[PDB]
Design a protein around this ligand. Structure first.
Ligand SMILES: COc1cc(CC(=O)c2ccc(C#N)cc2)c([N+](=O)[O-])cc1OC
Lengths: 274, 54, 41, 59, 255, 58, 255, 41
């Protein structure tokens, strides 16, 4: 099919393809056949695995949180006791997927979530309880749960999923951005104010995901850890940028740590060392 | 209510003034209404903060 | 490839774009530059 | 102090000139709008777009 | 008879000429254009001042010394006080625009130096304080003076290590953004045409800067023996296909 | 497909669409193009998520 | 079903309505239009802000009392500080424009009063000092406050006897100019559309006022027994087919 | 969309009505009122 290199022989002309001027801002498509004698070879390659659809198309962990099943008697702040918990939806908490997404400026896609819940009984327990988890999506404007047993968990309009601990939850969500694409970066503010926040933290008000355990308490305490995975599908990306070099310090902002190790390796020897 | 997505402000003022006829002193009122144009769109169904129990 | 669900978001991955045009990044110059011809004429 | 028919009556004063009659921001999902049919329905959804129809009837 | 070296650009009643350019760059190979009906959302009929705002505005010249780190401007911020363009920015709720950036710097065939001139869309700066500190409105709206990368940090401001592009990425990869070099031995000017790049059809021109322009010395300036150890750098910008929408009272911004 | 707003320019007529009488009990379908100069825009929206089938359908 | 009484006027994002008008006047039966090539002289391509300047601007309301003499405004002067229109006036060497003037005044079926609303092209005012004294720039550029014909003379200012139209001609013949009356028992508003009237294709918008608008009480105001002895008068003006030419730095005018 | 069950109640959601006529609520007046014409003639 496609040729990787054409057959090219000796050369002696005034057409010098290897002499350019990089200050123009262009990367002239020079080939090996332009500076050496080559033979014919074929690609036998389409580059399907480097398509943005494939690059962002696999599940990556985007959040880990914890909730627990125990007696709620006396507990004043259920949220703090972790009788139920929150997740202010965002994809820049765990760096692996974040660096990939931030290889672009604007990004548009549907999301496929997979939520894994694992039980743990650190203290004395006679058996492993069979708990059912309820993950409810709380869009901005919806009433937030205050107690693991609010009226809010009725979830009449909020979408929510019920699944066994140890099992996995799965569903997809359409592209919910308010604009035509999501912003990986935002050089702006919410309004013209002297103190207001800067960055995409201003655009990322996606709401929360409330997690709880439907079962009443058992004699012992059970610790359920929840892991949320995200896979993008039907991907579109715009304006590629320089890859993240320094470590992250916060969700949403480009801030980097003070006093960080150099990122570029230093030669063990000369600039002439191999 | 979100700042980035604020819609602006609505106000009303006197262009000239309100003038009452003779033998009239009662208070004058305005009734205001709100509705959507066919223009309108709503997305992502969710629960409302306007009801509770528990 | 039978779609069991009603919404588009439900469907699986899109499959290779098969567009592949790097020139909007490698050659975003106003005046076309031909390989072999003086970069600066 | 409490909910009442008067909450719907916008007072207009005689022989006042260039003065403000009323004001409000346009967060249709809160404030004055929160209890109206529009506001009530709007709150069953996260996003909105389009044009609003605001009218005044003199009494 | 013609050449990439010699060029003329005329917008409105302003014209710039150069006899030592190195072609010109059109970001992502797209020329600026007006907002088409199919992409529009805002129902207001827009305003197109045309020639009164789509012209070249020249900022204060910077001084390139043997120790300069670089400079960073932001658009439309950099032109907020420029004639009618500026006025329209504050009187309207929304607006969109493209630009033609022309950076000038001439020396002699004895000097040597190489400036990187790049346009970065959505250049979200980082706080030098690290952690989760923000960057106050004032500091990302320097106006035509722009940000001097060799100046000291300041409370509420952005970090300025030229090396990390003010955002945690390495300088060397800034080339993935539409750019051009002003290499004194070849160049005299750099020209970049910027089309409107945003995830929305139109936007606020005061609370959001669409792109930032950076002029960064890579190969340091060197002057011939006994010559003044500095050269001036001048930036001239012209908006194009500018649209304003939602006119109201004039906006009041932080400081 | 469907237009969200038609293009409308200056106006000076005896046809005043924005003057009504709400005591009739009707909500006259007034549009932005009836009180301001507008450009053309499309809906790109069907309102499928606000159908009663969807509203009570979960 | 329609009537001269009820009207709507929409320019830009502004709309005025009236349910008690008396038709509307279009000066010399000509609607405003842009400057055609055949009549043009200035070779500069013009700027047409359209909707951002061609909209209704409302001036401060005047107070009509039993002793008012009248008021006089001048265009484009009266709108020099009005949004983008004003800005364009000072940033450009030249410009031309037409307008839609809407004067408002409502009372009750018990009141009585009759205002003459007229547009006078080239209303060259006279000095109250007589002889050959001039009228200083400041005094013919009152801005949106306009000139109060019942205020006292002032050094360098114009004469203000309503009776002689501030120029040595009798009030009664002011009707030869495009006008309308606001007769409380009939009227509620007065509307006049003004086309560009000048002996040149385009002109300076700061050193020359093309027309002046006068609101003059003819039949004095009378209110019902025991009512407030005054009524407010409001003037709303909207430029149309506005063109600006020769943009440069902002102009600085006397005081 | 193959119905595995015998009864109608078993089938899934109906899909958008696509009727959308607000006039029976916004304009339930006896005498037609044209936008632009005097509401009360
Ligand atoms: C499974 O958990 C959910 C997550 C989300 C958030 C979402 O999909 C999203 C993805 C990427 C970006 C970016 N950049 C912003 C938001 C939504 N949601 O937004 O509606 C609902 C969920 O449960 C209905």
């Amino acid at each position: 099919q496609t040729v990787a290199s054409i057959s090219s022989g000796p050369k002696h002309t005034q057409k010098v393809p290897i002499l350019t001027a990089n200050e123009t801002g262009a990367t002239m498509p020079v080939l090996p056949s332009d500076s050496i004698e080559t033979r014919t070879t074929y690609m036998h390659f389409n580059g399907s695995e480097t398509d943005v659809e494939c690059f962002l198309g696999r599940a990556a962990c985007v959040h880990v949180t914890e909730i627990q099943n125990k007696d709620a008697t006396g507990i004043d702040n259920h949220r703090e006791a972790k009788l139920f918990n929150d997740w202010k939806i965002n994809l820049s908490s765990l760096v692996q997927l974040r660096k990939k997404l931030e290889l672009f400026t604007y990004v548009r896609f549907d999301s496929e979530y997979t939520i894994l819940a694992t039980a743990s009984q650190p203290d004395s327990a006679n058996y492993s309880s069979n708990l059912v988890v309820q993950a409810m999506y709380v869009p901005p404007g919806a009433p937030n749960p205050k107690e693991w047993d609010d009226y809010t968990w009725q979830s009449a309009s909020n979408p929510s999923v019920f699944f066994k601990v140890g099992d996995t939850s799965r569903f997809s969500v359409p592209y919910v951005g308010l604009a035509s694409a999501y912003n990986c970066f935002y050089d702006g503010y919410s309004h013209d104010d002297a103190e207001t926040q800067y960055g995409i933290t201003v655009l990322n008000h996606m709401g929360s995901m409330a997690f709880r355990i439907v079962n009443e308490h058992d004699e012992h305490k059970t610790l359920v850890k929840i892991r949320v995975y995200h896979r993008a599908k039907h991907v579109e990306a715009w304006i590629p940028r320089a890859p993240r070099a320094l470590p992250y310090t916060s969700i949403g902002r480009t801030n980097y740590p003070k006093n960080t190790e150099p990122v570029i390796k230093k030669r063990k020897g000369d600039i002439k060392s191999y | 209510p979100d700042t980035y997505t604020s819609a602006g402000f609505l106000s009303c003022w006197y262009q000239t003034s309100l003038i009452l006829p003779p033998e009239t002193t009662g208070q004058v009122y305005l009734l205001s209404f709100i509705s959507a144009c066919p223009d309108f769109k709503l997305r992502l169904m969710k629960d409302t903060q306007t009801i509770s129990q528990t | 490839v039978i779609n069991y669900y009603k919404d588009a978001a439900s469907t699986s991955s899109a499959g290779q774009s098969l567009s592949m045009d790097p020139s909007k990044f490698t050659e975003p110059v106003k005046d076309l530059m031909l390989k072999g011809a003086p970069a600066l004429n | 102090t409490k909910d009442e028919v008067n909450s719907y009556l916008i007072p207009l004063n005689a022989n006042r000139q260039n003065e403000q009659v009323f004001g409000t921001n346009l967060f249709i999902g809160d404030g004055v709008f929160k209890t109206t049919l529009l506001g009530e329905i709007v709150q069953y959804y996260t996003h909105w777009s389009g044009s609003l129809r605001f009218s005044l009837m003199y009494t | 008879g013609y050449s990439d070296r010699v060029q003329q650009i005329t917008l409105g009643n302003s014209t710039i000429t150069t006899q030592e350019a190195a072609n010109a760059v059109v970001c992502y190979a797209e020329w600026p254009e007006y907002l088409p009906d199919v992409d529009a959302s805002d129902v207001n009929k827009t305003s197109k001042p045309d020639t009164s705002v789509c012209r070249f505005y020249t900022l204060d010249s910077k001084t390139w010394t043997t120790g300069s780190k670089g400079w960073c401007w932001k658009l439309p911020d950099a032109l907020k006080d420029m004639g009618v363009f500026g006025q329209n920015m504050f009187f309207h709720s929304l607006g969109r625009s493209g630009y033609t950036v022309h950076v000038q710097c001439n020396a002699t065939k004895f000097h040597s130096g190489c400036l990187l001139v790049v346009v970065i869309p959505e250049h979200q700066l980082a706080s030098h304080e690290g952690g989760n500190v923000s960057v106050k409105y004032t500091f990302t709206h320097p106006g035509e003076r722009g940000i001097d990368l060799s100046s000291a940090n300041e409370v509420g401001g952005p970090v300025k290590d030229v090396i990390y592009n003010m955002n945690g990425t390495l300088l060397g990869n800034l080339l993935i953004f539409p750019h051009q070099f002003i290499n004194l031995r070849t160049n005299n000017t750099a020209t970049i045409v910027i089309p409107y790049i945003n995830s929305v059809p139109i936007d606020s021109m005061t609370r959001h800067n669409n792109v930032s322009l950076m002029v960064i010395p890579i190969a340091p300036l060197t002057v011939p023996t006994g010559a003044t150890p500095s050269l001036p750098i001048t930036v001239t910008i012209a908006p194009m296909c500018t649209e304003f929408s939602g006119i109201r009272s004039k906006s009041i911004v932080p400081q």
